[PDB]
């Protein structure tokens, strides 16, 4: 009788713990997305600067 109510309490605590772990995993994914974006901008600027200064500019 009380065992079923304690089991529902256990189910609620398990779902809360799984939700908190998924929050931590979303934070780990978001920091990787941030590193991905900063290196996208850095290598886009380096690629345009290299193809300008090394390929077209002396060759004109």
């Amino acid at each position: 009788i009380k065992e079923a109510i304690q089991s529902v309490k256990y189910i609620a605590e398990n779902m809360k713990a799984q939700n908190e772990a998924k929050e931590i995993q979303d934070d780990w994914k978001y920091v990787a997305m941030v590193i991905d974006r900063i290196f996208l901008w850095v290598f886009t600027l380096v690629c345009i600067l290299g193809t300008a200064g090394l390929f077209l500019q002396p060759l004109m």
Binding site: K2, V8, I11, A12, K29, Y30
Partner: protein, 74 residues
């Protein structure tokens, strides 16, 4: 078009222009057409219901992102 497939509500947020453009105009244009112990128990069951409703909302938004990627692909 592969990047807009894996967008989730925990990372991105769907802008209203990509709400209203890639779901209504172009799918119709490209032929897509879509006592004290008892008290804690009610609190736990209400928490379970809130969690399942939030999970269904997030799944609906990620299915929306998948359909947007499908429309851009076509």
């Amino acid at each position: 078009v592969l990047n807009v497939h894996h967008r989730s509500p925990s990372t991105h947020t769907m802008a209203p222009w990509v709400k209203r453009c890639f779901l209504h105009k172009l799918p119709t244009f490209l032929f897509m057409k879509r006592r004290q112990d008892v008290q804690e128990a009610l609190e736990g069951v209400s928490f379970i219901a809130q969690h399942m409703k939030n999970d269904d909302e997030d799944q609906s938004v990620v299915e929306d992102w998948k359909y947007v990627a499908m429309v851009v692909d076509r």
